[PDB]
Design a protein around this ligand. Structure first.
Ligand SMILES: CCCCCCCC(=O)O
Ligand SMILES: CCCCCCCC(=O)O
Ligand SMILES: [Mn+2]
Ligand SMILES: [Mn+2]
Ligand SMILES: [Mn+2]
Ligand SMILES: [Mn+2]
Ligand SMILES: [Mn+2]
Ligand SMILES: [Mn+2]
Lengths: 274, 274
């Protein structure tokens, strides 16, 4: 549908908007290029591993490559919804969000290619709980926004995408991969990529918090919705963790399991009822 | 709707895809930041101008700020449509396209702010022909893609967006602004911005050509559609030029008018019937 006019013709960008400021920070801090990462030592590391050691790394990598590909595709309805609401500064920021996710997809796929597993179908490490989140609930919640951009719908989309997928699973995923391979001295190229990815994702979670809080600020009752949507997805979060834990047991899992519980609970505390 | 699986889990990025290669080029060549441009001399230049000289610059700036804001918003349906078709490499490239347009919007709005016209409503310099293109036909053609991603619909969207708006009007707009203010020695910050913008837009037009040509390659009859959609918009293109020409006459317009005719015709020649 038509444009009624243009904000930068009638006026200017809102230079003090929090998402304009986040956009500026993203440009300053968003220069890394996965194409520059040296994966040559990762290739040698992976080839020196035994077959059973090789397999141990793949379930987490399978979870991250799908996560990054999903969030690359599934942010587009949020950008559309906020554009249609006239939230220009949010849209400017989300162009950096979307491009970050493209680099994240690229990074993991370059690593798979370099270590010699690009031809392997890693889908076998997505259990039913993983699929419920990433194949189903995430795209459902985001695509809803094309026909329903109500505050309820936007809160639910930002909860599933930013607070659960990125703020709980991905955050715990980063941590876990460091807790394991930085200690072993393995995969320095991948760990550099993860460092850059984690820096990007700091910004992404701030957008999710801003979005949820500004809706909660209009009506305290949306706080209860936020908490409910978090709790709805917990069984699938922990059910995926239980599956990864069981795979690997076939590393302090009690410490990684608690990191996931910990992240879930601190995401809740970043939203204020008042 | 659901994800059936993920390309970078089942396999990898298609590293040889033309839009992956364009994506890589965009990252290498996409580092400029409008926030780094020094507009202090532009401010002094604009303030030294007489009121009548000041007004002469504003119709073109009004046309560009709306153009960049429109194309920032209106690329999102194309990204969605190609994502839904599984064209991952196109999507990766389009994250750089979208972010480029954000910077372009930002650049012109920073210039307006710096020279002291951000508070002026420049909408008065959008005539009926401008509105038909930018307020109406462009968003109509792109939004269509949410419900109709047929080859006809994709060709029409890429024709209006990439070949007319960017490849005919914007390209002629850049040229004109150089033909005028680089010669006068004025607005060095704005002209630096325009240089960077023109470099970005080289990539953007390659995406439009790739998209139209791959559809034409499936069925030669789509070539006739492409030419028809170009000719449909010509009256509004030239009608806007006639309006700008008349404003300014109230600089070789015969040379700028022919540049627009020239660009329109070479865009047609970048698409091959065969
Ligand atoms: C100990 C397992 C906890 C890490 C969560 C992994 C998330 C992911 O793989 O995307
Ligand atoms: C001589 C006028 C031709 C330049 C076209 C301007 C396009 C624009 O302002 O967006
Ligand atoms: Mn990511
Ligand atoms: Mn993210
Ligand atoms: Mn279960
Ligand atoms: Mn542009
Ligand atoms: Mn462009
Ligand atoms: Mn007319």
């Amino acid at each position: 549908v038509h444009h009624d006019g243009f904000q930068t013709v009638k006026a200017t960008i809102d230079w003090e908007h929090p998402m304009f400021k986040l956009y500026e920070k993203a440009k300053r801090n968003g220069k890394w290029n996965p194409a520059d990462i040296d994966f040559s030592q990762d290739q040698k590391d992976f080839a020196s591993l035994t077959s059973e050691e090789k397999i141990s790394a793949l379930p987490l990598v399978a979870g991250f490559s799908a996560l990054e590909e999903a969030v690359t595709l599934d942010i587009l309805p949020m950008a559309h919804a906020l554009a249609r609401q006239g939230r220009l500064e949010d849209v400017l920021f989300l162009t950096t969000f979307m491009h970050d996710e493209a680099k994240h997809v690229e990074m993991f796929s370059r690593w798979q290619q370099a270590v010699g597993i690009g031809q392997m179908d890693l889908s076998v490490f997505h259990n039913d709980h993983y699929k419920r989140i990433f194949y189903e609930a995430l795209p459902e919640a985001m695509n809803r926004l094309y026909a329903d951009d109500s505050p309820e719908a936007v809160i639910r989309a930002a909860t599933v995408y930013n607070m659960i997928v990125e703020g709980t699973l991905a955050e715990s995923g980063y941590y876990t991969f460091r807790q394991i391979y930085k200690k072993a001295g393995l995969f320095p190229g991948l760990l550099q990529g993860i460092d850059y990815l984690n820096m990007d994702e700091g910004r992404h979670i701030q957008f999710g918090i801003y979005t949820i809080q500004r809706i909660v600020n209009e009506d305290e009752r949306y706080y209860e919705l936020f908490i409910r949507y978090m709790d709805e997805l917990w069984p699938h979060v922990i059910g995926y963790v239980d599956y990864l834990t069981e795979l690997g047991k076939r590393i302090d899992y009690d410490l990684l399991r608690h990191y996931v519980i910990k992240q879930f609970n601190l995401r809740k505390k970043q939203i204020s009822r008042t």
